[PDB]
């Protein structure tokens, strides 16, 4: 019973998948701009004993 309704309603996930993919690509783009992570004179900080990065 779900085959035909899926075949006529699968276009309803295109935009949510686009949103999720855009969020993923924003995170990937963030990964390329970490040259000054925990290195600014204003926010430079000693790491906690367990954390590896201040932000990601």
Ligand X SMILES: CCCCCCCCCCCCCCCCCC(=O)OC[C@H](COP(=O)([O-])OCC(O)COP(=O)([O-])OC[C@@H](COC(=O)CCCCCCCCCCCCCCCCC)OC(=O)CCCCCCCCCCCCCCCCC)OC(=O)CCCCCCCCCCCCCCCCC
State the nearest-atom distance from the C-beta of 49 to another protein, in Å. Answer: 28
Binding residues among 1-56 for ligand X as defined by CB under 6 A: 14, 17
Helices (H) and strands (E) in the chain, counts: 2, 0
Q: Measuring CA to CA, how many Å separate 16 from each of 4, 10, 20, 42?
A: 21, 11, 6, 38
User: Measured between alpha carbons, how far apart are the two ends of the chain, in Å?
Assistant: 44
Binding residues among 17-46 for another protein as defined by CB under 8 A: 17-19, 21-23, 25-26, 29-30, 33
Binding-site ranges for ligand X (CB under 6 A): 14, 17
Binding-site ranges for another protein (CB under 8 A): 8, 11-12, 14-19, 21-23, 25-26, 29-30, 33
């Amino acid at each position: 019973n779900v085959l035909q309704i899926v075949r006529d309603h699968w276009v309803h996930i295109l935009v949510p998948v686009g949103f999720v993919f855009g969020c993923y690509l924003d995170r990937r783009s963030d990964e390329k701009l970490t040259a000054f992570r925990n290195k600014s004179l204003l926010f430079k900080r000693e790491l906690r004993p367990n954390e590896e990065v201040t932000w990601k």
